[PDB]
């Protein structure tokens, strides 16, 4: 496991979390590198840590730095993949174990209540999720319900011990107005898969060899030679409504 040792990254994450509202849930709290600074935001906090011995040590540390028994942070010894997320508004934050990143992201994207997620993960994953240099199939598949932001790059030297690759700080925000109804999620995500894996050179050829009016692409501001990665969230949703 790679614990966050760079205090500047801690300050940066706390700065982003401080601009949000409501209760906070932290994934992989560890020794409390983020938990202790997050508790000073005076908001309700739940810190999740799968190592029970480490979770008990963290519960003592959070209580010691808290105003006292009468006033704070609940430390839960649990696997976040099995943790029931509340359906009420909350904010999620975490330094994710790099081998469980996509499973944790899947669990969060299908989960309720949370309005913002502030997550530390592998740099290549955070880059693809934030659509740096164009969107990937997974980003476009979640775009009607969420927005992704790349806050910063984080060197492997900012962790102890050092991971094999660098990291990225990713923000995710739940759209208050979804672009596609959640009931149509599986058909929407199937269409996005079909376009990213379809044969053809460019959108005009891809949409031809697929099970769309020929005037549709240019009327929606899409160049016929464009690649699926160049489409915006609004264009994917218009394509879903069309098909």
Ligand X SMILES: Nc1ncnc2c1ncn2[C@@H]1O[C@H](C[C@@H](N)CC[C@H](N)C(=O)O)[C@@H](O)[C@H]1O
Quick one: which of 22, 23, 97, 149 contacts ligand X (CB under 6 A)? Answer: 97
For residue 86, the minimal CB distance to ligand X (Å) is 16
**Residue 11 burial class via C-beta count within 10 angstroms: exposed 0-12, middle 13-18, buried 19 and up:** exposed
Three-state DSSP at 230 gives helix
Size of the site for ligand X (CB under 6 A): 21
User: Is 219 exposed, middle or buried (CB count within 10 Å of its CB: 0-12, 13-18, 19+)?
Assistant: exposed
9, 17, 24, 33: residue in contact with ligand X (rule CB under 6 A): 33
Output 74 or 241, the one with its CB closest to ligand X: 74
Q: Which of 31-39, 137-145, 185-193, 197-205 is the region at the interface with ligand X (rule: CB under 6 A)?
A: 31-39
Select from 17-25, 74-82, 214-222, 228-236 the region that touches ligand X (CB under 6 A). 74-82
Interface of this chain with ligand X, residues 35 to 64, rule: CB under 6 A: 48-51
Residue from 11, 41, 52, 81 that binds ligand X (CB under 6 A)? 81
Residue 229 labeled ligand binder = no
Report the candidate in 38, 37, 31, 45 with the shortest Cα–Cα distance to residue 73: 45
Torsion over CA: 114, 119, 123, 127 (sign): positive
Q: Which is nearer to ligand X, 100 or 179 (CB)?
A: 100
Burial class (CB in 10 A: 0-12, 13-18, 19+), 123: buried
Nearer to ligand X, 114 or 188 (CB): 114
| 28 annotated binding-site participant | yes
Helix (H) or strand (E) holding 120: strand 114-122
43-61 burial code (b ≥16 CB/10 A, e <16): bebbbbbbeeebbebbbeb
Does 80 participate in binding ligand X (rule CB under 6 A)? Answer: yes
Regarding 163 and contact with ligand X (CB under 6 A), the answer is no
Burial of 38 (0-12, 13-18, 19+ CB in 10 A): buried
Residue 144 near ligand X by CB under 6 A: no
Q: Does 15 count as an annotated binding residue?
A: no
65 binds ligand X (CB under 6 A): no
For residue 93, the 8-state DSSP code is E
Is 29 a residue that touches ligand X (CB under 6 A)? yes
In this chain, which stretch among 27-35, 137-145, 146-154, 221-229 interacts with ligand X, using CB under 6 A?
Answer: 27-35
Range 99-138, binding ligand X (CB under 6 A)? 100
Q: Is position 95 an interface residue for ligand X (rule: CB under 6 A)?
A: yes
Rounded to whole angstroms, the Cα distance separating 242 from 207 reads: 12
Site residues (vs ligand X, CB under 6 A):
1-4, 27-31, 33-34, 48-51, 79-81, 95, 97, 100
């Amino acid at each position: 496991q790679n614990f966050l040792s760079d205090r500047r990254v801690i300050a940066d994450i706390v700065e982003i979390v401080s601009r949000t509202n409501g209760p906070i849930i932290e994934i992989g709290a560890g020794d409390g590198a983020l938990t202790i600074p997050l508790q000073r935001l005076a908001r309700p906090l739940t810190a999740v840590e799968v190592d029970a011995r480490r979770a008990r040590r963290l519960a003592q540390r959070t209580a010691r730095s808290a105003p006292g028994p009468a006033s704070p942070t609940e430390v839960v010894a649990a696997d976040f993949l099995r943790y029931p997320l509340p359906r009420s508004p909350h904010v999620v934050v975490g330094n994710l174990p790099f081998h469980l990143t996509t499973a944790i992201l899947r669990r969060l994207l299908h989960g309720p209540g949370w309005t913002t997620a502030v997550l530390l993960m592998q740099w290549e994953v955070a880059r693809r999720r934030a659509a740096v240099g164009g969107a990937t199939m997974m980003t476009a598949q979640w775009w009607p319900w969420f927005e992704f932001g790349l806050a910063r790059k984080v060197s492997a030297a900012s962790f102890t011990p050092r991971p094999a690759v660098d990291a990225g700080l990713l923000t995710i925000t739940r759209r208050s107005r979804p672009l596609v109804d959640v009931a149509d999620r599986a058909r929407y995500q199937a269409l996005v898969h079909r376009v990213f894996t379809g044969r053809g050179h460019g959108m005009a050829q891809i949409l031809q060899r697929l099970p769309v009016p020929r005037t549709w692409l240019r009327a929606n501001g899409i160049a016929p030679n464009s690649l699926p990665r160049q489409l915006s969230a609004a264009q994917w949703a218009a394509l879903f409504e069309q098909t």
